[PDB]
Amino acid sequence: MNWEEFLDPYIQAVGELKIKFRGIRKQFRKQKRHSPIEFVTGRVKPIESIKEKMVLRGIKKENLTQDMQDIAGLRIMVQFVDDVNDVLELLRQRKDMKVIQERDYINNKPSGYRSYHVIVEYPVDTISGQRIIMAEIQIRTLAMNFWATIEHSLNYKYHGEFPEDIKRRLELTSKIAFQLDEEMRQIRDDIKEAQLLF
Numbered sequence: 772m773n774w775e776e777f778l779d780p781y782i783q784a785v786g787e788l789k790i791k792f793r794g795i796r797k798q799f800r801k802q803k804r805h806s807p808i809e810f811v812t813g814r815v816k817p818i819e820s821i822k823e824k825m826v827l828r829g830i831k832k833e834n835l836t837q838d839m840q841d842i843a844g845l846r847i848m849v850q851f852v853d854d855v856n857d858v859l860e861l862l863r864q865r866k867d868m869k870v871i872q873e874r875d876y877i878n879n880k881p882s883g884y885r886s887y888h889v890i891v892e893y894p895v896d897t898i899s900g901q902r903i904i905m906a907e908i909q910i911r912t913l914a915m916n917f918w919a920t921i922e923h924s925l926n927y928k929y930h931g932e933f934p935e936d937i938k939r940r941l942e943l944t945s946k947i948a949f950q951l952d953e954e955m956r957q958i959r960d961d962i963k964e965a966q967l968l969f
Contacts, residue, residue, distance in 0.1 A: 780902040781843045805963045807857035813845035841907035868893045881949045885915045918948045
């Protein structure tokens with residue numbers, strides 16, 4: 772396995788997806804409207820994480836491109852829970868990628884992980900030709916991302932097997948995350964209105 776080469780079209784894809792997705796927000800703002808997207812991050816999944824996923828899901832290297840969904844990973848940070856579906860409508864109507872899988876972890880008991888996962892096939896032109904790669908786009912509130920980022924690191928270290936205090940701290944914290952979001956979305960029309968006074 773030569774990773775630097777295999778990974779090249781995913782590095783490119785993250786870069787293009789970043790600039791494409793950051794332009795949705797520019798468009799809304801130029802039209803002086805509320806933007807469903809607040810900002811956008813993204814990175815190629817590290818070589819070690821790919822190998823683990825390969826061991827865990829049983830994906831051979833010859834089947835990486837066709838079978839692994841989240842090598843390129845993108846994050847669309849939205850302000851309100853409600854903004855997720857608007858980001859979704861936009862993503863589904865794009866023609867430079869095709870949506871091939873959605874998974875809703877937002878309606879997913881007011882507690883635990885909260886996020887929305889979209890897998891897209893993205894054609895990337897390289898110097899040796901076109902490659903169809905898969906990218907995982909996660910859509911999140913600021914609070915959702917705050918928690919998911921923390922739970923994810925703790926998780927690595929403990930390999931999913933949490934102490935008791937951690938466990939209940941993660942759940943407690945998770946419910947606070949939800950409350951903050953649940954509260955703000957209710958006055959969301961009002962906040963948007965205030966911000967639209969630029």
